[PDB]
A = this chain, B = another copy of it.
């Protein structure tokens, strides 16, 4: 039984970040990883997604070429070219992460970890035992798929993982789900030329975002050529002579349900949720608490219910983002190895960018959330809607919408929501301002940068 100061199960964002900081602090750490280092973000998430987004962005910009004084650009996007380049780049990152671990003197234990029956918390990987007084579970999650029992033929569809395996651009694609991943995938496939449908159970996407954003985002998708199938769900999927045939039920409220067949589908992409990876951990041997989806339950300090066992990142099921897993993993290392007992991540005011077209940036409370927290009488919002100057000379148009949610007399900024060209890079510093507790006067007292989109947020009235 090899003993370490810190054993981290999972070599993705949270697990690596935590292991690296711990090692800086003098800890003797080891990371168990059964697949590729970098985990979801590098292999099948953040990185490959962004590359595909940059590609889709090229496609749109190329539509404006002639408007800008150039000759029309004519053609066909070649999926395999970019796919090969994207894979290579992921390969480069995996090699860097491995090197980062080595330079830090962190041991990499390759294989699938599981807890043992042993009294003092101990794991087994490939027959060998490993123990530490602090063990971090950072095993992440996976895409959720429907059971054949509920939706026959569901296994004919792919997930976001399968999306990163595709080698040709699917001619006809149907995406099921209304969350950010669904939105992102629909936007990429459509911009690159796939005849794309997005099938959502209600009338808008991103229903948990501020309502200005869910409305605007739904319209932008339609305007970009994505067919949004509202109040619809899949009833069955079948393999026809040439592709898939999707049977769906559309049930608009105030109307009779109607069943429709969608034929000749090349790609059926389930983007319905993520499930935690805890199933094969043998958690029950230690009696570690999970919720009914399999998420590990933790407190504000990432503690599980068992002493010396922690969990961070996707596996915990809250704020499923690369930077949160990293920040939580880091704060945890400072708490354990630097003896900073108050060291923990604040889960409020975490900013998010959704890589739609145009991108979305959000931080803090939606208007409804502020209304429930402070009361209608105490909430004031400011908003603007305009066409960015980039489109002054284009036939194709996109809008920029921004909304500021203020609370109390002081007009504290408690929420910022926007969608528009450049909003992906614009959000970070306002997130800093929001975290510091800025009020509207603080924004108003900052001299604008002209001509930009960003200047609209400091000149709202």
- Per-residue contact bits, chain A 388-422, to B (CB 8 Å; 1 contact, 0 not): 01101100000000000000000000000000001
Contact B65 A353, beta carbon cutoff 8 Å: no
Contact A65 B62, beta carbon cutoff 8 Å: yes
Which secondary structure dominates chain A's binding surface?
A: helix
Contact B68 A70, beta carbon cutoff 8 Å: no
User: Does any Cβ of B come within 8 Å of A215's Cβ?
Assistant: no
Whether A449 contacts B432 in the complex (CB less than 8 A), given A390-B54, A393-B89, A425-B454, comes out as no
Residues of chain A at interface, number, CB under 8 A? 78
- Per-residue contact bits, chain A 349-392, to B (CB 8 Å; 1 contact, 0 not): 11111000000010000000000000000000000000001101
Question: Which of A46, A352, A353, A448 counts the most chain B CB atoms within 10 A?
Answer: A448
Contact B389 A50, beta carbon cutoff 8 Å: yes
Contact A54 B70, beta carbon cutoff 8 Å: no
User: What is the bound-complex CA distance between A436 and B413, given in angstroms?
Assistant: 13
User: Does any Cβ of B come within 8 Å of A321's Cβ?
Assistant: yes
Whether A429 contacts B453 in the complex (CB less than 8 A), given A393-B85, A442-B436, comes out as no
Residues of chain B within 8 A (CB-CB) of A163 are none
- Per-residue contact bits, chain A 318-349, to B (CB 8 Å; 1 contact, 0 not): 00011110110000000000000000011001
User: What is the bound-complex CA distance between A447 and B69, given in angstroms?
Assistant: 41
30 pairs, CB–CB < 8 Å, chain A vs chain B: A46-B450, A47-B389, A51-B393, A54-B393, A55-B69, A58-B61, A62-B73, A69-B77, A69-B81, A70-B73, A70-B78, A71-B74, A85-B393, A86-B393, A89-B393, A323-B447, A323-B450, A327-B448, A351-B447, A352-B449, A353-B449, A422-B422, A422-B424, A422-B425, A423-B425, A428-B452, A429-B429, A429-B432, A430-B432, A432-B438
